[PDB]
Amino acid sequence: ELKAIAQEFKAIAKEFKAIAFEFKAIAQK
Amino acid sequence: ELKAIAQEFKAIAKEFKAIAFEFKAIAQK
Amino acid sequence: ELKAIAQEFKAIAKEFKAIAFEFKAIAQK
Amino acid sequence: ELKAIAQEFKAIAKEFKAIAFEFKAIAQK
Amino acid sequence: ELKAIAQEFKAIAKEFKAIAFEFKAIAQK
Amino acid sequence: ELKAIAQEFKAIAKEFKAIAFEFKAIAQK
Numbered sequence: 001e002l003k004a005i006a007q008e009f010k011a012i013a014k015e016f017k018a019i020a021f022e023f024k025a026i027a028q029k
Numbered sequence: 030e031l032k033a034i035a036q037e038f039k040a041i042a043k044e045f046k047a048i049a050f051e052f053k054a055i056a057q058k
Numbered sequence: 059e060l061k062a063i064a065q066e067f068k069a070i071a072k073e074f075k076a077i078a079f080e081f082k083a084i085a086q087k
Numbered sequence: 088e089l090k091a092i093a094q095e096f097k098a099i100a101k102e103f104k105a106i107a108f109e110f111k112a113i114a115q116k
Numbered sequence: 117e118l119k120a121i122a123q124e125f126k127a128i129a130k131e132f133k134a135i136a137f138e139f140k141a142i143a144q145k
Numbered sequence: 146e147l148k149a150i151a152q153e154f155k156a157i158a159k160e161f162k163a164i165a166f167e168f169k170a171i172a173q174k
Contacts, residue, residue: 003169005168009162009164012041015040017155020154024148031084041074045067045070053064062105062109067102067106073095073096073102076091089142100132106129107122107125107129110122111122113118124161127160
């Protein structure tokens, strides 16, 4: 279940990377 | 994009909720 | 010692849930 | 409405600071 | 690796602390 | 300073991606 912990942080990172793109897109206005 | 920011943070909260339960199970033997 | 970590991630999830709710009411114009 | 978001990220930082402190005392064997 | 986990969470707490101040400045005009 | 918010989430994502590698590395034991 550390494998399971690791997979869950992998998804967190993917979600924060999209949030970064999103805010910058807003900031490009 | 604000609408997209919201669903991403909702998905993050979910992942952190699942992580907590996990660690609670490693701590509980 | 992992218990304290478990509780702290539980509190983090509580906070991201509220952030999501806030950006949604913001995106609601 | 951004104030509530500001306070919530402030509480999140407080929690990750404690998590870091905990894994360090764990890594201290 | 536990030692590396700790410094990463310390770096995360720092980033979230800076985000909070930022949002506090957008909210404060 | 939304550009600045975005850059800070970019770094958060980078830190959580390393944490994922780290835990899995531990789990591979």
